[PDB]
Write an enzyme that holds these catalytic residues in place. Structure first.
Site, PDB file in Angstrom:
ATOM      1  N   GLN A  11       0.825  -1.205   0.000  1.00 41.11           N
ATOM      2  CA  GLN A  11       0.000   0.000   0.000  1.00 41.11           C
ATOM      3  C   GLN A  11       0.862   1.258   0.000  1.00 41.11           C
ATOM      4  OE1 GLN A  11      -3.869   0.749   1.364  1.00 41.11           O
ATOM      5  NE2 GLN A  11      -3.105   2.453   0.118  1.00 41.11           N
ATOM      6  N   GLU A  72      -2.962  -6.991  -1.912  1.00 44.06           N
ATOM      7  CA  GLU A  72      -4.287  -6.468  -1.628  1.00 44.06           C
ATOM      8  C   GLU A  72      -4.821  -5.775  -2.871  1.00 44.06           C
ATOM      9  OE1 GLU A  72      -4.276  -3.755   1.618  1.00 44.06           O
ATOM     10  OE2 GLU A  72      -6.381  -3.177   1.384  1.00 44.06           O
ATOM     11  N   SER A 141       7.513  -0.706   2.148  1.00 50.45           N
ATOM     12  CA  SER A 141       7.199  -0.440   3.545  1.00 50.45           C
ATOM     13  C   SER A 141       7.909  -1.512   4.360  1.00 50.45           C
ATOM     14  CB  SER A 141       5.696  -0.450   3.805  1.00 50.45           C
ATOM     15  OG  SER A 141       5.430  -0.397   5.198  1.00 50.45           O
ATOM     16  N   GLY A 145       3.427  -6.596   5.677  1.00 51.77           N
ATOM     17  CA  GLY A 145       3.337  -7.916   5.077  1.00 51.77           C
ATOM     18  C   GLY A 145       3.796  -8.033   3.634  1.00 51.77           C
ATOM     19  N   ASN A 207       8.458   8.116   9.199  1.00 49.78           N
ATOM     20  CA  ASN A 207       7.295   8.978   9.007  1.00 49.78           C
ATOM     21  C   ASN A 207       7.171  10.019  10.112  1.00 49.78           C
ATOM     22  OD1 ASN A 207       6.544   7.740   6.627  1.00 49.78           O
ATOM     23  ND2 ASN A 207       5.009   6.405   7.576  1.00 49.78           N
ATOM     24  N   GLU A 255      28.302   6.395  -9.065  1.00 52.78           N
ATOM     25  CA  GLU A 255      29.106   7.359  -8.319  1.00 52.78           C
ATOM     26  C   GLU A 255      28.616   7.488  -6.882  1.00 52.78           C
ATOM     27  OE1 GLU A 255      31.290  10.446 -10.105  1.00 52.78           O
ATOM     28  OE2 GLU A 255      29.864  10.672 -11.758  1.00 52.78           O
TER      29      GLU A 255
END
Ligand SMILES: C/C(=C\c1csc(C)n1)[C@@H]1C[C@@H]2O[C@@H]2CCC[C@H](C)[C@H](O)[C@@H](C)C(=O)C(C)(C)[C@@H](O)CC(=O)O1
Ligand SMILES: Nc1nc2c(ncn2[C@@H]2O[C@H](COP(=O)(O)OP(=O)(O)OP(=O)(O)O)[C@@H](O)[C@H]2O)c(=O)[nH]1
Ligand SMILES: Nc1nc2c(ncn2[C@@H]2O[C@H](COP(=O)(O)OP(=O)(O)O)[C@@H](O)[C@H]2O)c(=O)[nH]1
Lengths: 440, 427
Positions: A11, A72, A141, A145, A207, A255
């Site tokens: 997601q 999903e 992420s 999962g 985050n 590089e």
């Protein structure tokens, strides 16, 4: 080199990929219908920028080189009904009919392997079309999962197939304080075990830090995942800017690996974006090269929750965009070196590599980031990164002592010794990181 | 994990099922004659979760209504919403179980069984990919407990890898209407812990307390309580039929909420709740919803949540909600009240978001907590059970159907084991 292929898993990875592709189309001036209108030629909408990603098909319509993998279906359906549904080949979006929950074992060992062959075939066809493939660009992420399991599995297979291509990974890390997943550390440790041995360069974003930048620097009262994704996308775009446009010092991915990776491991730099300026404050700012460089090393402008002053800087690379003088940049870097908070390790005489790209940055309408005539991206290897790993490890240990959620992983075809092995490998990585980074 | 099959069992289970289906139809914009009223892409795509599209555009829910008392199903068929259901999914025998778990579990339950399994197989064949089963019944009945547990055993035997999510209506510690309810409940939990993947425990007394306390009611009715339960049910599966920021799944619920196979039991809570007419004096804020959800008065199980300790929490927000806000308020609750959260698991709580708002509000939230306080209920019933089993009172009704005292002793031992394990993890 010519071509780069983007791969998005999960997601979060797919959403980030959407933002990134939107940004690339804005920079090159490509219509949401996949049209060179918005400027038709020259590096913004031209063969310079069209090579690397976008692939010109018949009738002059451009389809990006992008591959979306999600177990999903809902995410990819949402993308299929959005405005940018037109941009990409419908067969590049690959949807599974069962999630992985947040379980790395199902994406790696069971449900993810059902899609693995198909996505590998897709990658092979796209790679065949690519004339002069440079490498791959991964959007993950870490701790989920699909991103964790399918991302690691896919990355390993891709490395086995190609192996001399540069493999970049842009991962979204767990948060030191506030996280949304109960088993996230399990997944993260298990994935790092593979990522350390396959990915050539890994970029980490927390985050929480991006939220801090949105609330403090941009003064955004109610930030959304979309704005965060916009910032990250701008970082990635500035990474490939030296490939898509002409400049003074043109940096390649090889590089980056050369100057930023002293040893086979320690391929995990932090990233920072200095000109984060609210449209309210847009008229109170100078936009001076020295000031932007100073903003780079300010912890408030860093995208990971880590204190870089606590550790020692091994090697860094600044990447400048827009109207910037090389001499000014050099002077700013010299001042930063004289600050002494950098704490440059003894092996590196300089350890500051400067790229310069002659194209100005642009921002998506949904963000408070105002247009500026110059911008900087900061990629730095520091010892302080070990802190994050330690945090994760601790959260792992407390659970693993009671074998907290283990049965969910073991039922999917995992072993307990696998957990012990992955944690041991992470501890060894942290130990060697401190060992070299201290006495370097 | 697309299609879900709903199974209602007994008087209570069937009534709750009626309320639930009414709520789902209201959310998706379906007329009670089966022809859809509204279809919007968020409503129209995921119609396949609870509904099959019959020929000529008439939508029918995938549902199975089972009891041993024909009167309830007759009343359902003569109600408005009686049309929605395909008449083949109503299954009932003539002679009830009274309230005896033994009759419904093998003796008089065997009168139906196979027919229900056959219609389950037909529904399974009619679905592309099975996700799981929703089983709505009342612990402490004859039909809902016995036939329900038996049916769960058969379903897991045939479909072992599908999620079994049961919504159980538990006995109330203050003045229950049924006398032998403890026997039935203990017998039922014996099987429930061996088959159900996740069981949401609800008791009517807590619902009544919500009705009179927060909602200042004059004489509530069963349908009123059933509406609360239906809202919780809707909240659980929202991320399956709608898009969002952090989507969730039944397997994901199990993974985040189940440290050990023997702790699958959950408390539920819902926010907001405000009495009529004071709606104008309220502000819908993520902090306020969080306060409502951790308030002990808003627990729908009769246990004291402050007494126990939270193992794992899963919150679900709907409507206009920032992920950042939810993270902030959640972490504030974690830090402030950290005496209620187990230190052994660093991530105590996980969050999910759905952009669609429930009808009537811009923002709402459901609360699923796995806490040690649930042990209290297990203790109470246990005591009662033991007491009556000391005198072997009412036993002849059970043993006349083929029961043995060894089974009852085994059930009490299993209950004691559950309480002991919850005490172990309480630590
Ligand atoms: C309307 C409600 C809350 C609310 C509206 S604005 C705000 C800040 N909170 C909730 C909604 C919940 O689904 C539950 C309905 C519960 C109904 C009661 C059990 C009872 O049947 C009913 C007669 C009531 O007491 C109220 C009508 C006062 C009901 O509004 C209670 C309530 O807060 O419900
Ligand atoms: N930057 C960013 N992070 C996100 C986004 N959505 C989720 N995350 C983060 O990613 C983790 C949640 O992962 P999930 O989105 O549930 O799952 P996934 O890794 O994509 O895999 P699946 O569970 O199979 O869908 C947490 O760290 C989230 O805060 C997003 O849009 N942007
Ligand atoms: N919430 C709720 N509980 C109910 C309802 N009907 C019965 N109950 C409860 O279920 C128990 C009675 O069992 P019952 O429904 O008669 O079982 P059956 O004989 O198998 O149908 C008691 O706890 C009741 O309060 C209902 O409509 N809603």
């Amino acid at each position: 080199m010519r071509e780069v292929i983007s791969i998005n898993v999960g997601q979060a990875g797919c959403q980030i990929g959407n933002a990134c592709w939107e940004l690339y189309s804005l920079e090159h001036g490509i219509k949401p219908d996949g049209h060179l209108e918005d400027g038709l030629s020259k590096p913004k909408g031209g063969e310079e920028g069209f090579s690397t990603f976008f692939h010109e098909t018949g009738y002059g319509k451009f389809v990006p080189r992008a591959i979306y993998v999600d177990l999903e279906p809902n995410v990819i359906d949402e993308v299929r009904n959005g405005p940018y549904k037109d941009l990409f080949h419908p067969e590049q979006l690959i949807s599974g009919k069962e999630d992985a929950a947040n379980n790395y074992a199902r994406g790696h060992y069971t449900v993810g392997r059902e899609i693995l062959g198909d996505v590998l075939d897709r990658i092979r066809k796209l790679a065949d079309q690519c004339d002069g493939l440079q490498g791959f660009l991964f959007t993950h992420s870490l701790g989920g999962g699909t991103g964790s399991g399918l991302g690691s599995l896919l990355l390993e297979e891709l490395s086995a197939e190609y192996g001399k291509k540069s493999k970049l990974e842009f991962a979204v890390y767990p948060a030191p304080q506030v996280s949304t997943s109960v088993v996230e550390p399990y997944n993260t440790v298990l994935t790092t075990h593979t990522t350390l041995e396959h990915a050539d360069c890994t970029f980490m974003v927390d985050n929480e830090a991006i939220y801090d930048m949105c609330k403090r620097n941009l003064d955004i009262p109610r930030p959304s995942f979309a704005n965060l994704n916009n910032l990250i996308a701008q970082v990635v775009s500035s990474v490939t800017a030296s490939l898509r446009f002409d400049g003074s010092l043109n940096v390649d991915l090889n590089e980056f690996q050369t100057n930023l990776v002293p040893y086979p491991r320690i391929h995990f730099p932090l990233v920072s974006y200095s000109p984060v300026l609210s449209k309210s404050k847009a008229f109170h700012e100078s936009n001076s090269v020295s000031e932007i460089t100073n903003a780079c090393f300010e912890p408030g402008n860093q995208m990971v929750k880590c204190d870089p002053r606590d550790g020692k800087y091994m090697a860094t690379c600044l990447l400048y965009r827009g109207d910037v003088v090389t001499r000014d940049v050099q002077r700013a870097v010299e001042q930063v070196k004289n600050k002494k908070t950098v704490q440059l390790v003894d092996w590196c005489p300089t350890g500051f590599k400067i790229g310069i790209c002659y194209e100005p940055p642009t921002a998506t309408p949904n963000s408070q980031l105002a247009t500026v005539d110059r911008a900087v991206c900061m990629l730095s290897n520091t010892t302080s990164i070990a802190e994050a790993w330690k945090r994760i490890d601790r959260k792992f240990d407390l659970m693993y002592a009671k074998r907290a959620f283990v049965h969910w992983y073991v039922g999917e075809g995992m072993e307990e010794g696998e957990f012990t092995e992955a944690r041991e490998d992470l501890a060894a990585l942290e130990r060697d990181y401190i060992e070299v980074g201290a006495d370097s | 994990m697309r299609e879900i099959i709903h199974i209602s069992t007994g008087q209570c289970g069937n009534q709750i099922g009626a309320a639930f289906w009414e709520t789902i139809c209201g959310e998706h914009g379906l007329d009670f004659n089966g022809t859809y009223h509204g279809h919007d892409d968020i409503q129209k795509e995921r119609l396949n979760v609870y509904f099959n599209e019959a020929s000529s555009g008439k939508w029918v829910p995938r549902s199975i209504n089972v009891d041993l008392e024909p009167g309830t199903i007759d009343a359902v068929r003569n109600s408005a919403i009686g049309n929605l259901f395909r008449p083949d999914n109503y299954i009932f025998g003539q002679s009830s179980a009274g309230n005896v778990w033994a009759k419904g579990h093998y003796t008089e339950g065997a009168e139906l069984v196979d027919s229900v399994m056959d219609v389950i197989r037909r529904e399974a064949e009619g679905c592309d990919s099975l996700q799981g089963f929703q089983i709505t019944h009342s612990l402490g009945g004859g039909t809902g407990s016995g036939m329900g547990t038996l049916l769960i055993s058969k379903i897991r035997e045939e479909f072992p890898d599908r999620m079994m999510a049961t919504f159980s209506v538990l006995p109330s510690p203050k003045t229950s209407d049924t006398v032998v309810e403890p026997y039935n409940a203990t017998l039922s939990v014996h099987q429930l812990v061996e088959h159900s993947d996740e069981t949401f425990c609800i008791d009517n007394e807590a619902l009544y307390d919500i009705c009179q306390r927060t909602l200042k009611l004059n004489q509530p009715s069963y349908g009123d309580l059933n509406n609360l339960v239906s809202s919780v049910m809707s909240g659980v599966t929202t991320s399956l039929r709608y898009p969002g920021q952090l989507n969730s799944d039944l397997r994901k619920l199990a993974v985040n909420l189940v440290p050990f196979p023997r702790l699958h039991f959950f408390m539920v809570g819902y926010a907001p709740l405000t009495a009529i007419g004071s709606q104008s004096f309220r502000s819908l804020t993520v902090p306020e919803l969080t306060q409502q959800m951790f308030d002990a008065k808003n627990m729908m199980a009769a246990a004291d949540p402050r007494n126990g300790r939270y193992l794992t929490v899963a919150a679900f927000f709907r409507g206009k909600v920032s992920v950042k806000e939810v993270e902030d308020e959640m972490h504030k609750v974690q830090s402030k009240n950290s005496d209620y959260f187990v230190e052994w698991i660093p991530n105590n709580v996980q969050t999910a978001v759905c952009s669609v708002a429930p009808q009537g509000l811009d923002m709402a939230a459901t609360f699923i907590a796995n806490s040690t306080s649930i042990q209290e209920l297990f203790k109470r019933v246990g005591d009662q059970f033991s007491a009556m089993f000391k005198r072997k009172a009412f036993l002849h009704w059970y043993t006349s159907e083929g029961m043995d005292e060894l089974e009852f002793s085994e059930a009490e031992s299993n209950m004691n084991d559950l309480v002991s394990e919850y005490q172990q993890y309480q630590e």
